[PDB]
RNA sequence: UUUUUUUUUUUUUUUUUUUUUUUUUUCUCCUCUUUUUUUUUUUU
């Protein structure tokens, strides 16, 4: 959310993403569009679980629809 | 009743060349609560 992105900097490489089912951990991905996609669902995948992190790493895949409209 | 003389617009043209997007950082990060997980069935 915004008040916790304006504090990430403005070139915040690393970012944390919240999944949609409670069964899945949170994922560490690196993007540079976080301050203009705070009203959309997105999609990611997974390449490698690393042990120097408590979470698994990822990377963005494609955009999805908008939060609020049935589509 | 007033003669004679005092040059002018730099000369030159017939020289070879075998490279190539970019370029250089920013750390670790507490996801709150009825559950085992329901399940046949038929009309698309």
UniProtKB/Swiss-Prot annotation:
Transmembrane segments annotated in the record for this chain: none
Superkingdom: Eukaryota
All copies of domain CSD2, residue ranges: 15-71
Location of this chain's protein in the cell: Cytoplasm
Family: Belongs to the RNR ribonuclease family.
Quaternary structure, from the entry: Component of the RNA exosome complex. The catalytically inactive RNA exosome core (Exo-9) complex is believed to associate with catalytic subunits EXOSC10, and DIS3 or DIS3L in cytoplasmic- and nuclear-specific RNA exosome complex forms.
Biological role: Catalytic component of the RNA exosome complex which has 3'->5' exoribonuclease activity and participates in a multitude of cellular RNA processing and degradation events. In the cytoplasm, the RNA exosome complex is involved in general mRNA turnover and specifically degrades inherently unstable mRNAs containing AU-rich elements (AREs) within their 3' untranslated regions, and in RNA surveillance pathways, preventing translation of aberrant mRNAs. It seems to be involved in degradation of histone mRNA.
Stated name of the protein: DIS3-like exonuclease 1
Organism expressing this protein natively: Homo sapiens (Human)
Gene: DIS3L
Part of the full-length chain shown: 351 to 421 of 1054
């Amino acid at each position: 959310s915004k008040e916790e992105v304006q504090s990430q900097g403005k070139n915040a490489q690393k970012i944390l993403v919240t999944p949609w089912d409670y069964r899945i951990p949170k994922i560490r991905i690196s993007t540079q569009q976080a301050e203009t996609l705070q009203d959309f669902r997105v999609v990611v995948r997974i390449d490698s679980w690393e042990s120097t992190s408590v979470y698994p790493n990822g990377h963005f895949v494609r955009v999805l629809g908008r939060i609020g409209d049935l589509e």
